[PDB]
Amino acid sequence: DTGAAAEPRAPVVTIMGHVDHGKTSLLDYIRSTKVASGEAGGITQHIGAYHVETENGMITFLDTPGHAAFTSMRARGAQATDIVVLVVAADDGVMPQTIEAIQHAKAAQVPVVVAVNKIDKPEADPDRVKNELSQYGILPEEWGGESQFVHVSAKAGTGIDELLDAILLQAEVLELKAVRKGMASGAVIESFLDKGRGPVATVLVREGTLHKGDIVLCGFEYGRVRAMRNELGQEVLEAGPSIPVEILGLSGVPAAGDEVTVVRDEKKAREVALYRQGKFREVKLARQQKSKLENMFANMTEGEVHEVNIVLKADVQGSVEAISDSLLKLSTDEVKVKIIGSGVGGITETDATLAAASNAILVGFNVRADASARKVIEAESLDLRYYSVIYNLIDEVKAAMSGMLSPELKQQIIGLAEVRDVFKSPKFGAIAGCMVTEGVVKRHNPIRVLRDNVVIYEGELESLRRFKDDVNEVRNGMECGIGVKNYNDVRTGDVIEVFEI
Amino acid sequence: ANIKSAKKRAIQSEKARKHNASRRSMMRTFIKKVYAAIEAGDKAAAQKAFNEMQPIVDRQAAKGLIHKNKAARHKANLTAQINKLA
Amino acid sequence: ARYLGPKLKLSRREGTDLFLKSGVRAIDTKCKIEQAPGQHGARKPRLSDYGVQLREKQKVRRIYGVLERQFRNYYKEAARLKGNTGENLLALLEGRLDNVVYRMGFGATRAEARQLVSHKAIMVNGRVVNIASYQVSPNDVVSIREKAKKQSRVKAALELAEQREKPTWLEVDAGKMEGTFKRKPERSDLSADINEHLIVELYSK
RNA sequence: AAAUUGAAGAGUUUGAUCAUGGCUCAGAUUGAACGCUGGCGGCAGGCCUAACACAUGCAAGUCGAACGGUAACAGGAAGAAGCUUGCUUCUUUGCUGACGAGUGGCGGACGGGUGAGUAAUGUCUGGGAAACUGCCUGAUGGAGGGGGAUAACUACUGGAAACGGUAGCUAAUACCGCAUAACGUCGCAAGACCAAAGAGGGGGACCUUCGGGCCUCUUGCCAUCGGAUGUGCCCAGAUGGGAUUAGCUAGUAGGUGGGGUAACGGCUCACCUAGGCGACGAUCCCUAGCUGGUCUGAGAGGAUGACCAGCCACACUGGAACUGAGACACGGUCCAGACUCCUACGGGAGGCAGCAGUGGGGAAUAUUGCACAAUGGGCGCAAGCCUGAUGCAGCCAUGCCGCGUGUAUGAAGAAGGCCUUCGGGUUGUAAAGUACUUUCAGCGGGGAGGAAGGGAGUAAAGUUAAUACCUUUGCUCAUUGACGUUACCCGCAGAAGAAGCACCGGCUAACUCCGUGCCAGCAGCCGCGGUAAUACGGAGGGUGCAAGCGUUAAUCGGAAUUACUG
Question: What does the induction field say (chain A)?
Fold first, then answer.
């Protein structure tokens, strides 16, 4: 990074909102692709960057879905981009997910331009959007707050001409700083694991430069680049600070996002990469000692000790950190759920072994079973379930948890009976003569013995016997007899409450 | 096949195969006629058949369909047997 | 790859002068020569049989400036060679260029001579040799190259040399700053309070 | 002259002893890993695990001097014109330098990968007799006269693709008769029978149908007997363990005859005999590629079979043959299986144990690099084209070897630290200071060798009608290096950018203080830890190694502790 060379670049733009403003539609129409609703779920659960060539100059587009679950993706996408766009619908207005995107725009000090998505529907009006978002300091219009609004059809494909112009201008009015040659650096969009290609990452390069021989260092991972891939293009020789290019040949799957810096030699970068691992490992053992010692007691003070374990491996690195945060949101005091061994991709022997030791569900956002993986899963009793969307996953884990519970709250009473004139029996130690005042008494149904409104004893009937008949059922207002084991003292005036479950 | 010439070789070897098959089937036919005469006890039919067979087991040897030694045994063997009867 | 620390410590531990300084000074006016280094130098070592063998090998190594790996390889070669192994070890050491440069008086110490060698100030047969362990042969002529000839270290080095006993197997012309390795030194040429057979014993067990 | 001329013991049972006997250590070695640390270079090594699965590129082509040929680009041309009258753009025509697709030839059986299978259609040693063998090679002769086809292409048509369907039509060194036919095959012999192909370079009278004839040389084709190399086959010995496996065997063992192979042979079939193997280990079970050699050992042995070289076996799994001199074919074919990819849903496609690279497994093993310049392989008359063989480069202290991280001087011997009986000792000539050097790294400058050849001309010989051509050998001219910023040499700047690791109770080189108090902890073996701990942890000091040092794993040694030597 020497010479202080300043060259203009294509602005990187991210788009945020409440789900359903047709945020994806804006991109696909410009891209003339329409990959929307071609994928499972009908919505975009993943992040990707796509550069297009349109007058004037060059521009690239980035998009992140807006959901309660993706706390991290929208936070990282804002700070990386020079310009942020916020989609808003006149029918939808403002929503708590959209205001969440407002904070990401201001805290990242990134200038913002917006577009009205629906001009097609007659019940949709712009004035509603402007005024209601007026209250918030963001999105002023012609009040001297320099922000500009755009009205697009998004279905009609109507300009757009204005939105595009604003974006170009907004990037034009601010000085565009970059360099064509120098020390390469940037951030990682999304990383995942491939079977043939190996571990890969999608990287935005702040300073644009690359070469097959150049050594690159991403986080605590290091390595030489074997090959370069750009979008549909299978191979690219050179990559500029503007257009994003998928990086390949790194040692292992890096963090979901971080700062990446190339180096001259790999040997010099080996010690640095190992140094970052030591710190990350030291804090890992540090946070491990605290959480265990935090209770300051050998066990839990109450009965919440019952928990459920899960095993998760997702193909993409961006999800495992992001959805886990949303997976910890569904956690409750009663039943505690925890993730064990989050994977970078697929499935493996040591992963199936991990679920073998402790009973757990093995789930993946997207995964396929390995040849060696099937043998283990099919042999021992386990469960392999893959889910296209995170919503179907977040629901069933909860379902697993709800089932875990075992509460008996009664529990409607089957019958209520009062006992009188106790008799003695060798087997049960006592037989309490009874008279059923209400309902029908049954054999295997549980009972609640109470005296003066408080419960003296509890249990389940073992023998229901009237005379020498020993009938399994006794109706109300019919003389009845009762005895139970582990009940020492029979007193008159108390009432026994039997209830079905 | 994957390589350009490998493709071509498979085509050529099939042609050769159908060529060789045809000539080879013909040859065995003319050999079999001699053994059939022998098994019926006729000198003349078997000598006659041997004379038709001779030039073609010889020729197919020259043409690489069989080796010289094979042609010779056939002539040696049949000649042995036909003489042993008449 | 070289011992760079304090030098008189080594002499003090081995109980003898190892000639690691020029000799301009009585060594006893530079250190407590007759006492080992450290808090417990005054302490006497009631020294095991292994101990005496170790220290003798260290002594020779520290004289010639050789670390263990190379010195062990020197033993191996002495052993392989014909004739007495102990004597062969000392022939090999005494044939090193850094050593020969020292004995012709071009360097005040073997350390200084070694620097002369490494820094391309020494030629063998008018050819530049810059590796210290270069084995010098009978009839070889080692010389200070023209450009290194005006170095004041060399003049001083030759003066001191003139005051040491003069080695038989070398013919040195102080004016030309060239000299001739006439022959391998005999055993009788070398100091008699070196106990090679101890070193030979250490490396056979 | 020399070339196995070589061999160590220590700790630990006991109160102590001698013996017995195991455990443990000092040593060499490693395709190593991990922990701390890490400057340069030369040479080597680098998936030991999953013969697990593989995206993408590349790893086998080449010849227009066999052939019909033009579709690309390149000129050339009657004739169209760019025309500003020698510069030219396009319409045309293979006219030719070349060359996509096609037929044809030679190579795809080599080179490269792996060790799954195999205790024997293996390997090693040593021998046999019944055989084939492309290219290269010696010998002697042929190379005559014909015939019917076909891809390409053309027309019509089906497919999403892969790839097809009709009918035309044409060439050859493709293919087949006919002749010729022995020092060949069959046969006692008499006799009977078998092949082939052209293509180029140059040219004197001579001339035509201007194609060439004809003259000449090169080269390819056919036959037969040899050489050389390769391969097939047979016998003997040796080449792991187990009896908690003792009996095994119907093509089984042999004989006759037919068939079969390139060839001997139960190789195969019919018939006949009733044999054949086995305690000198058969059968069955477990394991395994064998060797040269490698490591260790004084030796005898023990352990072992990466890297290099020889043999074998395999090529996703099971089976099969076709072509061919050679294969039952590593990037060929067919069937079945397992699996994966493409699809417009009807159908298609593929096999990294080649080189990179990916996922997976693992404590762990590299770049999707450059070049055919060199050696070597394929094709070609050559030029040349192809060559992940190979030469090189990148990565990793993985190992071996070399060198540096300065040299010399520097004393009451400072400050600080540490111990101390407060006298002093030590760190320590160490540091600071003083001169001095500049390897290596940095930066500029210059510059071997790996290069032999091949190309134009020229001259001489052998050729021949010939000074052509061809080929050989001299001559000159201009040229060919991926590595490469090469090795190496000169110059510049300044000690400047380059020291860590383990150990210090005995075995075992290296001792003190403070902290702790049978705790926290150490520990190869003995054994340390409850108030003086040289054994824990820190410090100062010291010992041993040093770009490494330790720990773990592993073979042999010591172990005369499987003892043949002993």
Answer: Part of the metY operon that extends to pnp.
- Separation between the CA of A278 and the C1’ of D515 (whole angstroms): 30
Mark residue C126 as left, alpha or beta (left: phi above 0; alpha: psi -120 to 50; beta: remaining): left
Report the binding-site residues of A for GTP: 17-24, 63-67, 117-120
Q: Structural domain tally of chain C?
A: 2
CA A467/CA A480 separation, integer angstroms: 8
Look up the protein residue whose alpha carbon has the minimum distance to the C1' of D426: C39
Q: How was this structure determined?
A: cryo-EM
B contact chains, 3+ CB pairs < 8 A: none
My answer on whether C133 and C151 are in the same domain is yes
Query: Nearest CA to A159 among A151, A147, A167?
Result: A151
Dig out the tokens for C9 from the structure.
Answer: 């410590």
Q: In chain D, which nucleotides are within 7 Å of a protein Cβ?
A: 7-8, 26, 28, 36, 38-39, 50, 52-56, 60-62, 101-108, 131-133, 175-177, 184-187, 192-196, 222-224, 258-263, 322-325, 329, 331-333, 350-352, 357-362, 366-369, 394-397, 401-411, 413, 418-419, 425-430, 436-439, 488-491, 499, 507-512, 540-547, 549
Residue C98 lies in a domain: yes
The answer on C174 and C101 residing in a single domain is: yes
Residue C1 lies in a domain: no
Tell whether omega for the bond before C144 is within 30 degrees of 0, i.e. cis.
no
Nearest protein residue to nucleotide D418 (CA to C1' distance) is C39
In-domain check, residue C74: yes
Total number of residues shown for chain A? 501
Residue C78 and residue C54 in one domain:
yes
Supply the range of the domain harboring residue B21.
1-86
Return the nearest residue to D404, CA–C1': C1
Q: Are residues C43 and C83 in the same domain?
A: yes
Separation in Å: D164 C1' and B20 CA: 27
Q: How far is CA A444 from CA A148, A447, A462, A501, in A?
A: 74, 9, 7, 10
CATH of the domain at C31: 1.10.1050.10
The answer to whether A21 and A69 are in contact (CB under 8 A) is no
The Å distance, CA of A38 to C1' of D345, is 19
- CA-to-C1' span, B6 to D327 (A): 15
**Stated resolution in angstroms:** 13.5
Give the chains touching C; criterion: ≥3 Cβ pairs < 8 Å.
Answer: none
Instruction: Please report, for the domain that includes residue C106, its CATH number.
Output: 3.10.290.10
A191: β partners = A201
Number of domains in chain B: 1
